[PDB]
Amino acid sequence: GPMDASVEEEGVRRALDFAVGEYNKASNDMYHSRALQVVRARKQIVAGVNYFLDVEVGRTTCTKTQPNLDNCPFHKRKAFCSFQIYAVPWQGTMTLSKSTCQDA
């Protein structure tokens, strides 16, 4: 989650300049705009990994409601999948950003 950030931080002030710039690009106005003042400043450290996994996937001889599926024997369907996964490894979180499969 977000936490308090001090405007003393170089990165905070650099982000103000950026956003003010973006405002000027967006605005229909001949006049330049700049910040009167920051009224709130927060930061969130972002740290994760994207996994890009190209995999071939087969059909086992077990149903999905069965046990010990990790070493369940293989069979005829064989697919190619490209997965993209975002992980925050010390939070033990993972999220599927993209899954694209075809028969192979």
User: Least distance from C-beta 66 to a second copy, angstroms?
Assistant: 7
Long-range contacts of 22-29 (CB under 8 A, 24+ apart): none
User: Would the CA dihedral through 20, 24, 28, 33 be positive or negative?
Assistant: positive
* Contact pick of 6, 8, 74, 91 for a second copy (by CB under 8 A): 74
* Contact pick of 6, 8, 15, 102 for a second copy (by CB under 8 A): 15
- As a whole number of angstroms, the distance between CA 32 and CA 103 comes to 56
- How many residues touch a second copy under the rule CB under 8 A: the total is 72
Binders of a second copy in range 35-64 (CB under 8 A): 35-64
